[PDB]
Each structure stands twice: as C-alpha cells, then as structure tokens.
C-alpha cells in the first residue's frame, strides 16, 4: 500500500586506528538491498536483494563512486562538528544521517525527510517543506549557513521530489513479487508449566512481512494487557520477522484465554486458542 | 539510488 | 569541436547535447575561445522547462535528456566551443562533447 | 584575468622530468577542482577538494600525478617521470561550495603542458 525508500549512513572516527569508518545501507520498506562498508577490502557498493543485481555496471559503480566520496566528506564532517565543540582530538565520535521517500499510495510522493545525528543527539534537520533547515543548538547554525551558501536544500527537493521516487517506483516493481506480496503469519501456542499452579501462554507468529503487527491476549473477550509479556519484533535473519506475546494463567483456564493478532497480510484478524 | 554527495558539515 | 555548426552573422544558433545521467540536478553551457579557459554562459535548474538571459535561452527535456542553447541575432563575438555540463549534488561537472560555432560574417 | 590563477600558463618538459602545476582559487571558495583536456575537447574529471580533503583522485591516469591542497588554499598537482601521453591543459575551478546552479564559481585560464622527446 504505503511504500518507501530509506538509507541509513553512520561514521565513526577512531583516532589512532585508520580514518574513520563509513557504513551506509539502504532499505524499500523493511529490504535492505544496498550495502557499503568503508572498510572492506574491496569496497564497493554491494546489492543485498535479487531485485537490484540485474542493473548493470554502469549502476553498481556509479553507486561505489558515490559512496566512496561520501565517506570523505563525513570525514571532513567529523573534524568540522569536532572543531565545533572543541572536541579533544583523541576522542571518538559519531554522525549519523537518515532521509528517505514515503511514496503514498497516491503515487506520488507523500513526504521527504533528511536528518542528522552527532553523538546520538539531532544536529540538523530537513524542515517538512523540503525549502529550510532546523538546526538543534549553535553549532548547528553554522552548518545551516554553509549549506545555504551550497544551495544544499534546493538539491534535496530535487533528489527527494524525483530520483527518490522514480527509482522507488521502479524497484517496487522490480521486486513485486515480494516487496508488494504482504506475508501472513504463522502463529501457534505454546504451553509452559510455571508453578503447581500457573502456567503461561505463549502466542508465536513467525515468517511475516512486513514487521508491522500486533498480539493481544485476551480472557473473556476483554483487553488483558497489564500482566502481557512482549517481545520485540525481531528479525528471522531471511526476511521474515519474530514475535511472541505470553501471559501467565491459572492452571486450569487454558481456554479462557485467546490471542489475537493483526497484520497486513491476514484479511480479518486471526483469533488463536492453546491446543492441550 | 542514494543522495550523490553530501555537502560537509 | 566534435560536432561543428556555421550560422550567418544576425541570425539564430541552436547548439544541441544528450547528457548522460536523468538525475542531473542542474545542466550548464560553457563557451570556451581559442586558448582561453571556460566560461560560465547559463544554467538551469532541472525541475524548469526553460530559462533565458539576454540573447540566450535555455530549453530543457527531460526522459529525452535533451538540451538546448539558442543564441539570438547571433554576431562574430559568438565564434568558439560550447559544452555541455551537468552536475548533482557535491560532485564535479561532467562534459559532454563540444560543438564548434562559426560566424559567417 | 580577474579569477583564479594557474601559475605555469605554458610548460616544455622532456621526457622523464617532473612538473608541478599550481592554482591560485578564491580566498573564501571551500572547493576546488581540476581538469584534463585535449584538443578542443571536453574537459575530463581528475581529483577535487573538499577544503584540503580530497574527496576523490580516480580521475588521475596515472600514480605519478599527485594532487594536494595543504592549507585549503592553494592547490598543487605534480606529475613525476612525465610521458608523451601528458602532453594537454590542466584546468583548475573553485567555487563557494559546490557547483549547484547560482553558486559562485571560476574556472582558471589553464595550463598547456608540452611533453618534449
């Protein structure tokens, strides 16, 4: 329904162990489908879907060219936000920048965004009108200033209003066969003994995608969330995710209880009981 | 396709 | 000097290119004289359908990655290289192939 | 010649010297680039700078061309055991920051370096 392409950038510098290291990924959704490390042997932009490898040189190292001098400008970056803040020199230290497209369902695009982090706190960021920045405290400002001066935000509203969604559009269909065939769950219910008597309810859904979902338990038909065990929704490593939701019951009332999950894939929610 | 280069900080 | 074009003193030039990447944030026309350095002529932004300065206008078409410089009532001053060039984001202009202009006088 | 200034302009070297070729951008400009050209031909990407950072050298044909910018101002490219091949103009430009349309920039009156037998 709602799609959109997101790259993540870190650089970390590491005095007295190399220049600092640059690692960029890039996701459609929940795929990550490029990858560039600053530190492998051959660095080079890398696809990690079977949706992007059938672009061609001409694509792949126009890609690596462009990571590779990004990586030099974070670390031109990172001595500029040290100067800053008059940073000692041996100290390491972190940027972070994340922007992306939300192709709405419109087909159109829905929404730009472009922010940075330096430390893990938010430096600067690309204001919703795609024409301005936001800049957290005075050192910000100074770099508000220089990219005025590069007509930095003019450069953004081309890259975000245009490339960002022609080629998201164009990976979408690409890769439609998965990145647009939503995944349902796998769910089950487990059984574990706790004391002579009480038990608890695990409720498992595995193998879905996107990770977007919701388990609720439920005794009597009513939202028994307090006493509620939640997991983080975690990756399966393959391109499905993990989740599981327990609560602890009276033995006994097994089937008072029943789990409810909702996602994309499932076209009415699914409501689970524990099989004895 | 990523951002081509960014300006410094 | 790839491809060469002669107008008549007073009339119109059209000078052509093909640039190579769509995502060009901006397309640029240099003139360079014999034995001189480039010159800055124009620009404009890839998001505009044309622009004009003067005696010069720009038009832009895109998906055919076509543009187009055309240099009204065009005099002897005008004789010498026009490039192409485009840019996006911070990297360095890239060039596109010459064409040399020569006024009949 | 109000700009940016390259210093050599005209330079004979025979085969198996050295040169070194120097650019003069504007004193506030933050980047910094340079090119190769051939007869009347496009000019062709060889390193540029970020301040004194260089932000990609791929351009260079060759290890024997080394570019650097020590203090963020002045630019030196050097090419050792120089050959019949590096025989064209060697062009400098600076700008602001970038070459975004609108920004300030220049480019420099080149170099025509002549390899000799």
């Known amino acids: 329904g709602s799609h959109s392409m997101r790259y993540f950038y870190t650089a970390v510098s590491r005095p007295g162990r190399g220049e600092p290291r640059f690692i960029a990924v890039g996701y459609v959704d929940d795929t990550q489908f490029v990858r560039f490390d600053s530190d492998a042997a051959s660095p080079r932009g890398e696809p990690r879907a079977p949706w992007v490898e059938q672009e061609g040189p001409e694509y792949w190292d126009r890609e690596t060219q462009k990571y590779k001098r990004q990586a030099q400008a974070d670390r031109v970056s990172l001595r500029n936000l040290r100067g800053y803040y008059n940073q000692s020199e041996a100290g390491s230290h972190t940027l972070q920048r994340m922007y992306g497209c939300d192709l709405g369902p419109d087909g159109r695009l829905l929404r730009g965004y472009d922010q940075s982090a330096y430390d893990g706190k938010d430096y600067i960021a690309l204001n919703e009108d795609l024409r301005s920045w936001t800049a957290a405290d005075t050192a910000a400002q100074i770099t508000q200033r220089k990219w005025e001066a590069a007509r930095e935000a003019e450069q953004w509203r081309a890259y975000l209003e245009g490339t960002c969604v022609e080629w998201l559009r164009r990976y979408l269909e690409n890769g439609k066969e998965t990145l647009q065939r939503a995944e349902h769950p796998k769910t089950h219910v487990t059984h574990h003994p706790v004391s002579d008597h009480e038990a608890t309810l695990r409720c498992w859904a595995l193998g879905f995608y996107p990770a977007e979902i919701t388990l609720t338990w439920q005794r009597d038909g009513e939202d028994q969330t307090q006493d509620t065990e939640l997991v983080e929704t975690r990756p399966a490593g393959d391109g499905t995710f993990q989740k599981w939701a327990a609560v602890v019951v009276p033995s006994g009332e097994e089937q008072r209880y029943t789990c409810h999950v909702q996602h994309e894939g499932l076209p009415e929610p699914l409501t689970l009981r524990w099989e004895p | 396709k990523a951002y081509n280069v960014t300006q410094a900080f | 000097q790839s491809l060469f074009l002669s107008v008549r003193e007073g009339d119109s030039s059209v000078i052509n290119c093909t640039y190579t990447?769509?995502?060009?944030?901006?397309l640029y026309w240099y003139k360079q004289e014999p034995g001189a350095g480039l010159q800055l002529l124009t620009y404009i932004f890839s998001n505009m359908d044309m622009k004009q300065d003067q005696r010069l206008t720009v038009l832009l078409n895109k998906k055919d990655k076509h543009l187009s410089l055309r240099i009204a009532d065009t005099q002897t001053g005008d004789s010498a290289i026009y490039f192409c060039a485009e840019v996006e984001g911070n990297t360095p202009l890239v060039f596109g192939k010459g064409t040399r202009l020569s006024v009949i006088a | 010649g109000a700009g940016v200034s390259q210093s050599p302009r005209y330079k004979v070297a025979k085969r198996g010297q050295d040169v070194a070729l120097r650019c003069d951008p504007i004193?506030?400009?933050?980047?910094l680039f340079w090119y190769q050209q051939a007869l009347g031909q496009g000019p062709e990407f060889l390193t540029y700078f970020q301040n004194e950072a260089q932000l990609d050298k791929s351009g260079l044909p060759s290890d024997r061309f080394f570019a650097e910018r020590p203090e963020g101002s002045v630019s030196t490219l050097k090419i050792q055991r120089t050959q019949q091949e590096d025989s064209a103009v060697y062009l400098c430009?600076?700008?602001?920051?970038?070459?975004?349309?609108?920004?300030?920039?220049?480019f420099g009156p080149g170099t025509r370096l002549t390899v000799l037998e």
């Open positions: 990447d769509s995502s060009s944030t901006y």
């Open positions: 004193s506030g400009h933050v980047s």
């Open positions: 430009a600076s700008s602001l920051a970038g070459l975004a349309g609108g920004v300030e920039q220049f």
